[PDB]
Enzyme design. Structure first.
Site, short mmCIF file in Angstrom:
data_model
loop_
_atom_site.label_atom_id
_atom_site.label_comp_id
_atom_site.label_asym_id
_atom_site.label_seq_id
_atom_site.Cartn_x
_atom_site.Cartn_y
_atom_site.Cartn_z
N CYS A 1 16.61 2.23 11.25
CA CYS A 1 16.94 1.09 10.38
C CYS A 1 17.55 1.58 9.10
N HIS B 1 0.83 -1.21 0.00
CA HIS B 1 0.00 0.00 0.00
C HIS B 1 0.85 1.24 0.00
N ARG C 1 30.62 15.09 -3.34
CA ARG C 1 30.63 13.72 -2.79
C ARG C 1 30.17 13.67 -1.36
N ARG C 2 29.58 14.78 -0.89
CA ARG C 2 29.20 14.96 0.51
C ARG C 2 27.69 15.18 0.71
N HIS D 1 17.56 -9.78 7.20
CA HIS D 1 17.00 -10.95 7.85
C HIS D 1 15.56 -11.24 7.51
N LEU D 2 15.22 -12.51 7.70
CA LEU D 2 13.83 -12.97 7.69
C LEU D 2 13.48 -13.49 9.08
N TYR D 3 12.40 -12.95 9.62
CA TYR D 3 11.90 -13.42 10.92
C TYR D 3 11.39 -14.83 10.82
N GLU E 1 4.09 8.21 5.35
CA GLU E 1 5.28 8.08 6.21
C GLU E 1 6.40 9.01 5.71
N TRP F 1 3.30 2.67 12.77
CA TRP F 1 4.21 3.06 13.88
C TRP F 1 3.63 2.86 15.27
N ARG G 1 21.03 -0.48 8.08
CA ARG G 1 21.80 -1.28 9.04
C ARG G 1 21.07 -2.56 9.45
N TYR H 1 13.81 9.44 12.83
CA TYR H 1 13.98 9.92 11.46
C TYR H 1 13.68 11.39 11.21
N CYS I 1 17.38 -4.86 8.36
CA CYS I 1 16.33 -5.00 7.35
C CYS I 1 15.50 -6.24 7.55
N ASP I 2 14.25 -5.99 7.91
CA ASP I 2 13.20 -7.01 7.92
C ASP I 2 12.82 -7.16 6.44
N1 LIG Z 1 10.40 -6.53 13.49
C1 LIG Z 1 10.17 -5.32 12.90
N2 LIG Z 1 10.06 -5.28 11.55
C2 LIG Z 1 9.85 -4.12 10.92
C3 LIG Z 1 9.78 -2.87 11.70
C4 LIG Z 1 9.95 -3.00 13.14
O1 LIG Z 1 9.94 -2.00 13.87
N3 LIG Z 1 10.14 -4.22 13.64
N4 LIG Z 1 9.53 -1.70 11.10
C5 LIG Z 1 9.53 -1.66 9.65
C6 LIG Z 1 9.00 -0.28 9.13
N5 LIG Z 1 8.12 -0.60 8.01
C7 LIG Z 1 6.95 -1.28 8.17
C8 LIG Z 1 6.29 -1.62 7.00
C9 LIG Z 1 5.10 -2.30 7.04
C10 LIG Z 1 4.54 -2.65 8.26
C11 LIG Z 1 3.29 -3.46 8.29
O2 LIG Z 1 2.94 -3.98 9.35
N6 LIG Z 1 2.77 -3.69 7.08
C12 LIG Z 1 1.65 -4.45 6.72
C13 LIG Z 1 0.33 -3.83 6.88
C14 LIG Z 1 0.40 -2.51 6.11
C15 LIG Z 1 -0.60 -1.57 6.74
O3 LIG Z 1 -0.50 -1.19 7.90
O4 LIG Z 1 -1.63 -1.16 6.00
C16 LIG Z 1 1.90 -5.39 5.62
O5 LIG Z 1 1.44 -6.63 5.59
O6 LIG Z 1 2.57 -4.98 4.68
C17 LIG Z 1 5.21 -2.38 9.45
C18 LIG Z 1 6.39 -1.67 9.40
C19 LIG Z 1 9.37 -2.98 8.90
N7 LIG Z 1 9.71 -4.14 9.60
C1 LIG Z 2 13.09 -1.08 10.85
C2 LIG Z 2 12.47 0.04 10.22
N1 LIG Z 2 12.04 1.10 10.98
O1 LIG Z 2 11.98 0.93 12.29
O2 LIG Z 2 11.64 2.18 10.55
C3 LIG Z 2 12.52 0.09 8.75
O3 LIG Z 2 12.23 1.08 8.06
N2 LIG Z 2 12.89 -1.03 8.12
C4 LIG Z 2 13.18 -2.17 8.75
O4 LIG Z 2 13.40 -3.20 8.08
N3 LIG Z 2 13.17 -2.25 10.13
C5 LIG Z 2 13.35 -3.53 10.80
C6 LIG Z 2 14.70 -4.13 11.00
C7 LIG Z 2 14.47 -4.94 12.27
O5 LIG Z 2 13.81 -6.16 11.94
C8 LIG Z 2 13.55 -4.07 13.08
C9 LIG Z 2 14.31 -3.06 13.93
O6 LIG Z 2 14.85 -3.76 15.01
P1 LIG Z 2 16.41 -3.55 15.46
O7 LIG Z 2 17.29 -3.85 14.25
O8 LIG Z 2 16.55 -4.55 16.56
O9 LIG Z 2 16.53 -2.11 15.86
O10 LIG Z 2 12.78 -3.37 12.12
C1 LIG Z 3 39.30 10.32 1.71
C2 LIG Z 3 39.89 9.75 2.85
N1 LIG Z 3 40.15 10.49 3.99
O1 LIG Z 3 40.11 11.81 3.80
O2 LIG Z 3 40.48 10.04 5.08
C3 LIG Z 3 40.00 8.29 2.87
O3 LIG Z 3 40.29 7.67 3.89
N2 LIG Z 3 39.76 7.61 1.74
C4 LIG Z 3 39.55 8.26 0.57
O4 LIG Z 3 39.42 7.62 -0.48
N3 LIG Z 3 39.41 9.62 0.53
C5 LIG Z 3 39.26 10.35 -0.75
C6 LIG Z 3 37.91 10.43 -1.41
C7 LIG Z 3 38.09 11.72 -2.20
O5 LIG Z 3 38.87 11.48 -3.38
C8 LIG Z 3 38.91 12.59 -1.27
C9 LIG Z 3 38.00 13.38 -0.32
O6 LIG Z 3 37.38 14.41 -1.08
P1 LIG Z 3 35.80 14.71 -0.92
O7 LIG Z 3 35.05 13.47 -1.35
O8 LIG Z 3 35.59 15.82 -1.90
O9 LIG Z 3 35.55 15.11 0.51
O10 LIG Z 3 39.70 11.68 -0.52
#
Ligand SMILES: Nc1nc2c(c(=O)[nH]1)N[C@H](CNc1ccc(C(=O)N[C@@H](CCC(=O)O)C(=O)O)cc1)CN2
Ligand SMILES: *[C@H]1[C@@H]([N+](=O)[O-])C(=O)NC(=O)N1[C@H]1C[C@H](O)[C@@H](COP(=O)(O)O)O1
Ligand SMILES: *[C@H]1[C@@H]([N+](=O)[O-])C(=O)NC(=O)N1[C@H]1C[C@H](O)[C@@H](COP(=O)(O)O)O1
Ligand SMILES: Nc1nc2c(c(=O)[nH]1)N[C@H](CNc1ccc(C(=O)N[C@@H](CCC(=O)O)C(=O)O)cc1)CN2
Lengths: 264, 264
Positions: free
Chosen positions: A146, A51, A126-127, A207-209, A58, A80, A166, A94, A168-169
């Site tokens: 995440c 959806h 590049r920044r 990951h997959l739960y 969001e 949320w 970092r 965020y 990913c569900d």
């Molecule tokens: N473990 C865990 N997993 C996650 C999050 C978390 O914090 N914990 N947060 C994430 C942030 N994104 C979402 C995306 C979808 C949903 C969700 O639940 N979706 C439904 C229902 C969609 C809806 O609400 O209409 C679905 O089946 O797609 C929840 C979090 C996703 N996975």
């Molecule tokens: C977290 C999430 N979010 O909280 O907004 C998002 O956008 N995507 C995610 O996949 N997501 C997942 C990863 C993990 O399964 C949980 C977060 O738990 P921790 O990694 O333990 O923080 O939500």
């Molecule tokens: C930057 C760098 N550092 O400054 O510590 C490093 O460790 N690795 C790099 O490759 N490095 C490079 C990327 C780019 O060519 C310049 C930095 O320039 P900006 O991207 O313009 O900041 O150094």
């Protein structure tokens, strides 16, 4: 989508068992990357109905710097709910970091405003980065971000974005995460008079739960369909002025939605 | 190394000509990922002679939290000279952010200690992160962090790490970046009584400077030699207590060094 299903299959096949924060358990891999050329179509998964409503609202919510779920509720978005406190607050997640990253001197940094100005004035930079990983505010957040860190890039008149996710569900989160960032690229490209390039997705703990295995086998049994096309119906004055009705997805032909419980 | 040469060739095959901050010009791609299994050997480029001495001292310098070049000069390391002010200061670059990230409420977070304790106590955490991307301090830094954000992971008794390198000078910088993080994984693993896993390298703007092309072609003409082996001779009581002479590289038989100018 092909790359999405390939990732799902890879986690199933190669993932190792993890006890995780939630106590649910996962199969997990570390380090993956996918690339979606946004000119090939809008990367909304077609092997289950996603959806766009929740995804769009969001994103708009992030962009307006909001971390209270009231706005989401106004628009019937409940994604949320499980982490918000009694007042509907998530802490400085965020949105707050995107628009108002706090510093020790009591000032605030608007990374989105910075990025727009970088794209318009220094597209070769590049920044061009947004980070939600505000180490000093992690302890106040309901969840650590995440989708933690993202970068823009411009070449040959095209805007690309890479996300470092970092955590990913794969089943519940990733389809949303991919669509959300793709939408953002389209919006910034529009505001910057650029065409769309790639969305590059990079995963950490991917990951997959354990309680999503039935759902995963069901989805893997399905063939993807051609991607839909995003239409932006109105160009607003700035990146902060979009509304839900500005977006239409045409040619979205998904398989049925698949229901699965979130791990809290 | 195969992965490294393949990346060079990928930049040549897919890259686009871009102007850059330094005025040098690059050939640039956006988004890459590769993996080094540290059990295969220590990933120090063999297709040119690299200076492990500078790599090691730079990392020990980071780990101390230092951002002034005096220590580097004391050890005849000149790699940071071009960006230091008249007093040898770089501002609150890597070292500072790693060891003393300032929070809004006046705390400082030692991210290296934080990660060490996470690995020891909760290695399945998905939040085992170090960020140098302190948005509020970027303006004080001589350069924005290139190696910007990294994450650790543990499975089957092996420690892995993934780096998001937002900007990568493939010829000059990347050999140092790969070796530095590989060393860090070994050190971290030692302190945690883990074996070594993979170093996963992810790039943002991944580029070859215009004035590195002769050198790149030369290097590409060469066959990788066997990976050298890293021997750590001592287990200090703290990750901050390593010494230069604790490290030895065995079996390093590189092709000749290749000189190239750095873009300021
Ligand atoms: N473990 C865990 N997993 C996650 C999050 C978390 O914090 N914990 N947060 C994430 C942030 N994104 C979402 C995306 C979808 C949903 C969700 O639940 N979706 C439904 C229902 C969609 C809806 O609400 O209409 C679905 O089946 O797609 C929840 C979090 C996703 N996975
Ligand atoms: C977290 C999430 N979010 O909280 O907004 C998002 O956008 N995507 C995610 O996949 N997501 C997942 C990863 C993990 O399964 C949980 C977060 O738990 P921790 O990694 O333990 O923080 O939500
Ligand atoms: C930057 C760098 N550092 O400054 O510590 C490093 O460790 N690795 C790099 O490759 N490095 C490079 C990327 C780019 O060519 C310049 C930095 O320039 P900006 O991207 O313009 O900041 O150094
Ligand atoms: N644009 C550009 N700017 C940079 C770096 C880069 O990567 N490219 N990296 C910086 C920190 N790291 C390095 C790494 C290697 C070198 C370098 O110049 N190395 C030589 C010479 C080393 C030596 O002193 O013996 C080599 O042949 O490997 C310089 C800065 C700072 N600024």
């Amino acid at each position: 989508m092909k790359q999405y299903l390939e990732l799902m299959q890879k986690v199933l096949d190669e993932g190792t068992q993890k006890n995780d924060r939630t106590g649910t358990g996962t199969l997990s891999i570390f380090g993956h990357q996918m690339r979606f050329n946004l000119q090939d179509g809008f990367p909304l998964v077609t092997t289950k109905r996603c959806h766009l409503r929740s995804i769009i609202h969001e994103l708009l919510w992030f962009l307006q710097g909001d971390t209270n779920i009231a706005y989401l509720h106004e628009n019937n978005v409940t994604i949320w709910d499980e982490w918000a406190d009694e007042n509907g607050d998530l802490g400085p997640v965020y949105g707050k970091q995107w628009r108002a990253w706090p510093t020790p001197d009591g000032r605030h940094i608007d990374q989105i405003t910075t990025v727009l100005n970088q794209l318009k004035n220094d597209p070769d930079s590049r920044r061009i980065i947004v980070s939600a990983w505000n180490v000093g505010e992690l302890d106040k957040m309901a969840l650590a971000p995440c989708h933690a860190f993202f970068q823009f890039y411009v070449a040959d008149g095209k805007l690309s974005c890479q996300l470092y996710q970092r955590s990913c569900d794969v089943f519940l989160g990733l389809p949303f995460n991919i669509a959300s960032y793709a939408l953002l690229v389209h919006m910034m490209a529009q505001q910057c008079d650029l065409e769309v390039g790639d969305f590059v997705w990079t995963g950490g703990d991917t990951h997959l739960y354990s309680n999503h295995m039935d759902q995963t086998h069901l989805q893997l049994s399905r063939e993807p369909r051609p991607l839909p096309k995003l239409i932006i119906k109105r160009k607003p004055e700035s990146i902060f002025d979009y509304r839900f009705e500005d977006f239409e997805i045409e040619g979205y032909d998904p398989h049925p939605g698949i229901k699965a419980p979130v791990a809290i």
